[PDB]
Write a protein that binds this ligand. Structure first.
Ligand SMILES: Nc1ncnc2c1ncn2[C@@H]1O[C@H](COP(=O)(O)OP(=O)(O)O)[C@@H](O)[C@H]1O
Ligand SMILES: [Mg+2]
Lengths: 84, 460, 173, 113
């Protein structure tokens, strides 16, 4: 039932209203010692400046699969998970 | 059409995923648009299902996960032939002199195997150079490898410029200069010097400098070898100058760990010996043609114990060991006469006279070194009169090893000197036999032949 | 690639399926879970940093047609350690395990032309006698063979194609 | 609200709800048996788990103990009150005299001038 079951999965996922991250957006998933890990953010270049909440900016240095590793340029003790 | 996508960008290393059929093979080239910039990737490992891990031949900045990659089904290929003469090129064989297209007839892949054992050709055709100590302690033959070992600032570049002047101009064949990891200023200065001297028409230049990402510094030496080997297969006698083998190995070291390898004894890659061997066994004189090569070898911390100089010692016919001690004392060139040798220094290969002269010089200087600390602590007059005679002759001999160069004229304010080999043998034979015992030490310092020594002695 | 991760969970699943006489059901349930694993938007959710329990419930919710013993518990145990991508591997492992216990070999053959039933029957019996299993031949008609047949029994293979003999003689020369 | 999940020597892992995770230098308080212990946050890991440092003895801590999230960093008395007395890292009095009569308390994590 390949087509039927894949359609079933699609309709339940759509009815659940879960959705992908928008490209050029992501969420912080770890903060530690001035280094942050971000989920999503597909259209991110290496060396790009990513805007954090506030006017603070972060440098995306490492583009792993399913994760972006960035360095905070300034104080970092104000950040947390769930931040767009 | 494009067939792959980028999945990781860690530093200078890029991973690309392809369909599990038609995965690129090792040392292939790939292409991706880094914005408006065409960027080339070189495949280094086939790992996992459909994934290849590669090195960027350019800046890795500006790359995104998910970019399309197009797999060229050949290695990095460079122009080869007469069209490369008089042109500066990068690692990919693209002109960087702003004179236009290369205009090549044929292009060759930079990854190729070394000559088979039965292709090797034996030679003992001694080259003559104007430098006294090199011709005396380490004469070398056409078709062989030469390495100038030295620490920081001991005279590698000046000696290589002098040797270019002395050898290449008499040489009627084509020459290749591979600027592996060179300073930009010194490359520009070399280019303009050759352009002024009107010898640029017989030299091909490949420059990969300090500022460029590790892949360029890794593969530029192979580009140079490819051009030299084209000339060799045409049957001509080629002169190949390599600026630093050290930074080929170092460009390997930078990216080794990012490729997943476990580190070696002194932090080097586990593949140092093989990486050296695959490159250096291609630089040989075969039965069709001969490559004669001069290489400058950096010595970290001025310590010859380090694995890189240690392994490259085992690849060379003649090894001129420069020392920071002799450079600091002001003797130029700073060649150590006790350490420098050549396998052409045989009484059969060279004149029997030449062999005996070299052996005697080395014996005397070895005997001086043991007395250095004796005299330093206990005093000059503790010596016997025979010992004091030996000390005198040793200091005179160690002065006569020095020489002014035409290319070391800007640093010192004196003309340059070229000494024939016969004159060098005659002078050192005369000094050891005591024919010039009565001249002062500076009468031998910074002069040419021994006739010039007696002329300066008269002036003194 | 995480074959070795799949082996523990696959052994647990197979060892449990014979304790409850539902190997045939367990195999298709594992297929169901693999199809869940393949979905694009679900894959993004799996890439997220959700806590294992809530992620497991978000996964269970799209797979309501699973038993209490099988789905709701194996999914959550794998989610506790984040090994849900091993479900595709667990499925293949499970099939191989079953074939071992049932004394069966999925022997595969390739031919330049279609075989008659008597030829295929003789090959089936001959491999049942070469091996010690009930074989299940499957054939594919590929012109690359040129003539003759290929016989593969997992790692082991027997090559009777004339192309192989041709290039073997070329290597003898 | 939160629970301890790991105890490794001086450091302790604590789990909080996905929407109620403390800040990078907030202070937590746990009841180790009949006595109270203070933990200081150091890193926000994924999934609402945070690594903390124990401001006291770590022995006797079972996993699965509940914690209270204080909504401020570690704060100590300052000024004329703290002028003839011996004090602990948490600003508590160490001499057997009475409490420190401070008008003001400052957080110990401040910025250089
Ligand atoms: N034969 C020489 N005569 C005068 N100066 C020299 C000579 N050899 C080296 N030097 C001095 O030492 C410097 C360092 O040596 P150089 O060859 O330029 O770099 P490296 O030795 O590191 O390749 C020279 O630039 C020059 O200042
Ligand atoms: Mg140099």
């Amino acid at each position: 039932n390949s087509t039927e079951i894949s359609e079933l999965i699609k309709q339940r996922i759509a009815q659940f209203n879960v959705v992908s991250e928008a490209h050029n957006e992501g969420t912080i998933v770890s903060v530690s010692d001035g280094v942050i890990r971000i989920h999503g953010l597909a259209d991110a270049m290496q060396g790009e400046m990513i805007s954090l909440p506030g006017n603070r900016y972060a440098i995306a240095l490492n583009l792993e699969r399913d994760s972006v590793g960035a360095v905070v340029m300034g104080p970092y003790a104000d950040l947390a998970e769930g931040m767009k | 059409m494009a067939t792959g996508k980028i999945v990781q960008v860690i530093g200078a290393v890029v991973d690309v995923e392809f369909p599990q059929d038609a995965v690129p093979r090792v040392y292939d080239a790939l292409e991706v648009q880094n914005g408006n910039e065409r960027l080339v990737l070189e495949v280094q490992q086939q790992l996992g299902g459909g994934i290849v891990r590669t090195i960027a031949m350019g800046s890795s900045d500006g790359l995104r996960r998910g970019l399309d990659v197009k797999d060229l089904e050949h290695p990095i290929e460079v122009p080869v032939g007469k069209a490369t003469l008089g042109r500066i090129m990068n690692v990919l064989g693209e002109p960087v002199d702003m004179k236009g297209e290369i205009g090549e007839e044929e292009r060759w892949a930079i990854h190729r195997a070394a000559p088979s054992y039965e292709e090797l050709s034996n030679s003992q055709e001694l080259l003559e150079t104007g430098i006294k100590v090199i011709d005396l302690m380490a004469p070398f033959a056409k078709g062989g490898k030469v390495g100038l070992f030295g620490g920081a600032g001991v005279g590698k570049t000046v000696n290589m410029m002098e040797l270019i002047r002395n050898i290449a101009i008499e040489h009627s064949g084509y020459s290749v200069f591979a600027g592996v990891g060179e300073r930009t200023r010194e490359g520009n200065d070399f280019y303009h010097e050759m352009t002024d001297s009107n010898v640029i028409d017989k030299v091909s230049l490949v420059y990969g400098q300090m500022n460029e990402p590790p892949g360029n510094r890794l593969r530029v030496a192979l580009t140079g070898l490819t051009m030299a080997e084209k000339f060799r297969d045409e049957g001509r006698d080629v002169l190949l100058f390599v600026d630093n083998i050290y930074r080929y190995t170092l460009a390997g070291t930078e990216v080794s760990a990012l490729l997943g390898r476990m580190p070696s004894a002194v932090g080097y890659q586990p593949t140092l010996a093989e990486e050296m061997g695959v490159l250096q066994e291609r630089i040989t004189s075969t039965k069709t043609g001969s490559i004669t090569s001069v290489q400058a070898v950096y010595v970290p911390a001025d310590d010859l114990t380090d694995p890189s100089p240690a392994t490259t010692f085992a690849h060379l016919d003649a090894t001129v060991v420069l020392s920071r001690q002799i450079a600091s004392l002001g003797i130029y060139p700073a060649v150590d006469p006790l350490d420098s040798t050549s396998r052409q220094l045989d009484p059969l290969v060279v004149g029997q006279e030449h062999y005996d002269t070299a052996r005697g010089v080395q014996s005397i200087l070895q005997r001086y070194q043991e007395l250095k600390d004796i005299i330093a602590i206990l005093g000059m007059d503790e010596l016997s009169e025979e010992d004091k005679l030996v000390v005198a002759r040793a200091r005179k001999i160690q002065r006569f090893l020095s020489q002014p160069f035409f290319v070391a004229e800007v640093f010192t304010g004196s003309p340059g000197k070229y000494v024939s080999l016969k004159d060098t043998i005659r002078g050192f034979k005369g000094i050891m036999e005591g024919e010039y015992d009565h001249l002062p030490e500076q009468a031998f310092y910074m002069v040419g032949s021994i006739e010039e020594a007696v002329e300066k002695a008269k002036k003194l | 690639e995480f074959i070795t991760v799949a082996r523990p969970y696959a052994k647990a699943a197979f060892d449990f399926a014979v304790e409850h006489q539902s190997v045939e059901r367990w195999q298709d349930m594992l297929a169901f879970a693999a199809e869940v694993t393949k979905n694009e938007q679900m894959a993004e959710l799996l890439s997220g940093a959700l806590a294992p329990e809530t992620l497991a419930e978000s996964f269970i919710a799209v797979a309501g047609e699973q038993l209490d013993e099988n789905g709701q518990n194996l999914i959550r145990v794998m989610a506790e350690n984040g090994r849900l991508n091993a479900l595709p591997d667990v499925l293949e492992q499970f099939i191989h395990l079953r074939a071992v216990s049932e004394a069966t070999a999925e022997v595969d053959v390739i031919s330049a032309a279609a075989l008659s039933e008597q030829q295929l029957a003789k090959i089936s019996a001959a491999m049942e006698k070469r091996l010690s299993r009930k074989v299940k031949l499957n054939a594919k008609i590929d012109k690359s063979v040129m003539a003759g047949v290929i016989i593969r029994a997992g790692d082991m293979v027997i090559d009777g194609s004339v192309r192989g003999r041709l290039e073997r003689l070329a290597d003898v020369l």
